[PDB]
Amino acid sequence: GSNVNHLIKVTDQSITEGYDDSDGIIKAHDAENLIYDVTFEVDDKVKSGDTMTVNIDKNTVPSDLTDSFAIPKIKDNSGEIIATGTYDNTNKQITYTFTDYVDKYCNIKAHLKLTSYIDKSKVPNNNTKLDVEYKTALSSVNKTITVEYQKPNENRTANLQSMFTNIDTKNHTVEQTIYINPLRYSAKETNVNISGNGDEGSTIIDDSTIIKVYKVGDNQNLPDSNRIYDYSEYEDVTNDDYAQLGNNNDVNINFGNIDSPYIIKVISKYDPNKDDYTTIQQTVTMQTTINEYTGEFRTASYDNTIAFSTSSGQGQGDLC
User: Fold this and answer.
1) Is 68 annotated for ligand binding?
2) Which of 22, 36, 130, 155 is most buried, most CB within 10 Å of its CB?
3) Is 25 among the annotated ligand-binding positions?
């Protein structure tokens, strides 16, 4: 069992954006993934137990919503598994190890369509030019792309932005990181209503929802990636006496008069057994009173929608 990269002949690779209308730009906040397509031959000499490698770009992860990601097993229309693979996140490398298969078939060949996303931990700033590099064995291919993030939606003092940062499909939960008042306006009587009522899907807002609120210090860092990797850096201001569930699968949060931005970390659950409007969706709305003489107020909204892309590997061969 040894590394057989030298016995692997890549016949065609290609890096691709998952969206046909943003070239050179990845809408990291629109779930635009990167696509790595590669085809390669596997020498007859390779044997059951041997391993090979595939490198996704250093600034990307197999998924932008989980961690426990599987690498597509390499199979053929026959059902037999040709090779399975593990993934090392420190180096962003996949390692496929061949099965009995390479001892039974000859003139073997396979193709991979590996999907990937921008690793926000490595790219937290809007407009970050990168030279991504994908590689299968000894053949690599490059591309130049610019990462772009969302801007906050606003109206008078109301202004926010959200993004899903994690999903537990095994336990039916989703993490939404919300930025309340990122523009530092003086927001009077701010109220944030979080809802499981989406127009295309939903989540469940109830007494099992975990809500964490943090205050962003004066000129403290607020990554355009819209994902917080180490919450310990911020002043925790949670206070459930200010969070009252609503009458409509929602929750209200009284922030009173604020001048700083806050981060709201929400963990909610979803029902995986719907027959329609099956998409996981959650909508945040920020309300503020913009007139002390009229009691009049303005809103700003932001919603999110779980969106993924799957990877895969097909192969084939001739009996020896």
Assistant:
1) no
2) 36
3) yes
